[PDB]
Amino acid sequence: SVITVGYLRLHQCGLPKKMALELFKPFIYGKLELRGLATTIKAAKKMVE
Amino acid sequence: FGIDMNTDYTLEEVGKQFDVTRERIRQIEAKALRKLRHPSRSEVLRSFLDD
Amino acid sequence: RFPALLAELNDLLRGELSRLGVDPAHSLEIVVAICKHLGGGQVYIPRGQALDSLIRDLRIWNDFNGRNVSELTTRYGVTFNTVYKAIRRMRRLK
Amino acid sequence: DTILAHLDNPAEDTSRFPALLAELNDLLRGELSRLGVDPAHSLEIVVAICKHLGGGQVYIPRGQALDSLIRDLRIWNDFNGRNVSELTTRYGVTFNTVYKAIRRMRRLK
Amino acid sequence: DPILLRPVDDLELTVRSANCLKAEAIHYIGDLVQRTEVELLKTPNSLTEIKDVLASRGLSLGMRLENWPPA
Incomplete structure (x- = not known):
């Protein structure tokens, strides 16, 4: 991505939401499976889509 | 269907094992299939229709 | 056909x-x-005898209020033991 | 019915x-x-x-037999005796199909 | 009391007793507990099977309950 300035704490970085779901997508699939809102993995894929 | 096995078996291949019945095994398969079409167990299966 | x-x-x-x-x-x-x-x-x-017998017994004990065992036997053609079974079954449900 | 609620599970009790x-x-x-x-x-x-x-x-x-049956039934359900052209206009089929449906209705017992 | 509103089905009584009370159409445990022993003996065929089962459940006939039935 491109860099930009921030009020943030020293140990915090601003990550945009659009890339957040893309990066942690497998984690989202697993958490959605454990939370029970998605019957199957591809259903979770549709939901994140 | 040969699932969990190296190969599948036809009607005559499974007849010599249990019983040589021809239409009876076919209707057993049909009954099992229609049992699997019940909307009590097939809710998860229907999601796999798109693939 | x-x-x-x-x-x-x-x-x-x-x-x-x-x-x-x-x-x-x-x-x-x-x-x-x-x-x-x-x-x-x-x-x-x-036929599907299960539901037919169940609705039969349901109508039987719907006709029953306190003392119509003789009329139930005359009409439905089932003895008093079947009536007892039906009453016990309807007691099972709450 | 009514008690069918309680019957929900007993409906399939010792069933077939x-x-x-x-x-x-x-x-x-x-x-x-x-x-x-x-x-x-x-x-x-x-x-x-x-x-x-x-x-x-x-x-x-399994196949086209039921398709022909449903087409012919939707044709013949609106037949009144003097509306053959009405059926042809509505269902977008030739006189042959509607007449065949009428013959299907006639030949049954 | 959580037993007065319960129906007579929670008694597990004998068939003769389960049949006799249907003649008077008793539907609540409170309804039968209001009735005393001096008038429930007139029905045919019970006199040796109610006191024990009622005592096992901590109830006794003849007690006076107001606002009955509360609906």
Whole structure:
């Protein structure tokens, strides 16, 4: 991505939401499976889509 | 269907094992299939229709 | 055999839909549903004695209020032991 | 019915192909929910299916036979004796198809 | 009391007793507990099977309950 300035704490970085779901997508699939809102993995894929 | 096995078996291949019945095994398969079409167990299966 | 049988099934289904208040022309997809999970051969669908006996006993004990055992036996053609079984069964449900 | 609520599980108690056709009422009650009426009426239809269609066995096809049957039934349901051209105009089919449907209605007993 | 509103089905009584009370159409445990022993003996065929089962459940006939039935 491109860099930009921030009020943030020293140990915090601003990550945009659009890339957040893309990066942690497998984690989202697993958490959605454990939370029970998605019957199957591809259903979770549709939901994140 | 040969699932969990190296190969599948036809009607005559499974007849010599249990019983040589021809239409009876076919209707057993049909009954099992229609049992699997019940909307009590097939809710998860229907999601796999798109693939 | 199959075309006439299917026609009879469809017309009877749509007539019952009209009786139930639904639109008769919605019968066709129902038989299509009958196809999609039941097509392939011929099956025997004679009575289904479970629900018939259950509704029979339900009507029997609906007629029963306190003392009509003799009339129940005369009408439904079942002895007093069946009446006792039905009353116990309706006591099971709360 | 009414007590059918309590009967929900006993409906399939020590059951048979009723339970299979219980699946039917599921679909039926689903369409009933689609229809707008209360789904719990579905059992009535199915028990009617037991009384006026039960007692025998039927073979069921898989292909174009039922397509021809549904086309011809939708053709002949609006026939009144003097509306052959009306059927041809409405259903977008030639006089041959509507006349064949009329012959189908005539030849049955 | 969580037993007065319960129906007579929670007694597990004998068939003769389960049949006799239906003649008077008793539907609540409170309804039968209001009735005393001096008038429930007139029905045919019970006199040796009610006190024990009622005592096992901590109840006794003849007690006076107001606002009955509360609906």
